Design a protein around this ligand. Structure first.
Ligand SMILES: CN1C(=O)CCc2cc(Br)ccc21
Length: 209
C-alpha cells in the first residue's frame, strides 16, 4: 500500500533549483547528510539519559557509508532517533518551508548552494548527485517506513517490509549516471576528511567486493 503525496510548492521549487542550477561543488551533499545523521544521533543519545530504555532498539550510535557499484547506490546509515510517519509527511516539510524561503532569499542576495545547511534544508542537497532518493527509517514510537522521491513534485510513503533496522535512518542515493565518482573509496575518504573530520560518532566507510 503506497501513498503518494505532493510536495509543497516552495519545496518543489527548491528541488527544481537544486537539480537544474549549474553548480560544480556537488560533494557537499555528503557533509549535509552526515550532519543530519549526527544530529539524529545526538537526539537519541540525549533522550536516553532520562529514559535508558530508548536504547533497547540498539545501543550502538554510529554512521556507516555503503557504496554499491552494481546498484549504483550510496547508502548513508545511522542509528539515530529515526523519523515517524508524521515526520515524513507533515513535520519535516513544515520546518523546511521557512528554511527554503530563507535560503532562496540568501541565494538571491549572493549566497551559494554550499550554505544550504545553515537553513535546515540540507537533506535536499542529495539531489545534486541522486536521480532518486529512498529513505528507510524507524523511530521507537512508530513502524518502519520507506519514503521515496524522484523529484517532479511528489513523494511516496509506504510501510517497509524489508530487513528490520532496529532504530535509525538509511538514506539510499540512486546516483545519476555521471556521478559515480561518489562510489569510489578514495573519493569518499577525501570528502569525509575534508568536511566531516570532527563528527563525534564513528563513521565507517564500507568497501566493495
Ligand atoms: C525533509 N525530509 C523529508 O521531507 C522526508 C525525508 C527526510 C529524511 C531526512 Br534523514 C531528512 C529530511 C527529510
Amino acid at each position: 500500500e503506497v501513498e503518494t503525496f505532493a510536495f509543497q510548492a516552495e519545496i518543489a521549487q527548491l528541488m527544481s533549483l537544486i537539480i537544474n542550477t549549474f553548480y560544480s561543488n556537488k560533494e557537499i551533499f555528503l557533509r549535509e547528510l552526515i550532519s543530519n545523521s549526527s544530529d539524529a544521533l545526538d537526539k537519541i543519545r540525549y533522550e536516553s539519559l532520562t529514559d535508558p530504555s530508548k536504547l533497547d532498539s540498539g545501543k550502538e550510535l554510529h554512521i556507516n557509508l555503503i557504496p554499491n557499484k552494481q546498484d549504483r547506490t550510496l547508502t548513508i546509515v545511522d542509528t539515530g532517533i529515526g523519523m515517524t510517519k508524521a515526520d515524513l509527511i507533515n513535520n519535516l516539510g513544515t520546518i523546511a518551508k521557512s528554511g527554503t524561503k530563507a535560503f532562496m532569499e540568501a541565494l538571491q542576495a549572493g549566497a551559494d548552494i554550499s550554505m544550504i545547511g545553515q537553513f535546515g534544508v540540507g537533506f535536499y542537497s542529495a539531489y545534486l548527485v541522486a536521480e532518486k532518493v529512498t529513505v528507510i527509517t524507524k523511530h521507537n514510537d512508530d513502524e518502519q517506513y520507506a519514503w521515496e522521491s524522484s523529484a517532479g513534485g511528489s513523494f511516496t510513503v509506504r510501510t517497509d517490509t524489508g530487513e528490520p533496522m532496529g532504530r535509525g535512518t538509511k538514506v539510499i542515493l540512486h546516483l545519476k549516471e555521471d556521478q559515480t565518482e561518489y562510489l569510489e573509496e578514495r573519493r569518499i575518504k577525501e570528502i569525509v576528511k575534508k568536511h566531516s573530520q570532527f563528527i563525534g560518532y564513528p563513521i565507517t566507510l564500507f568497501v566493495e567486493k
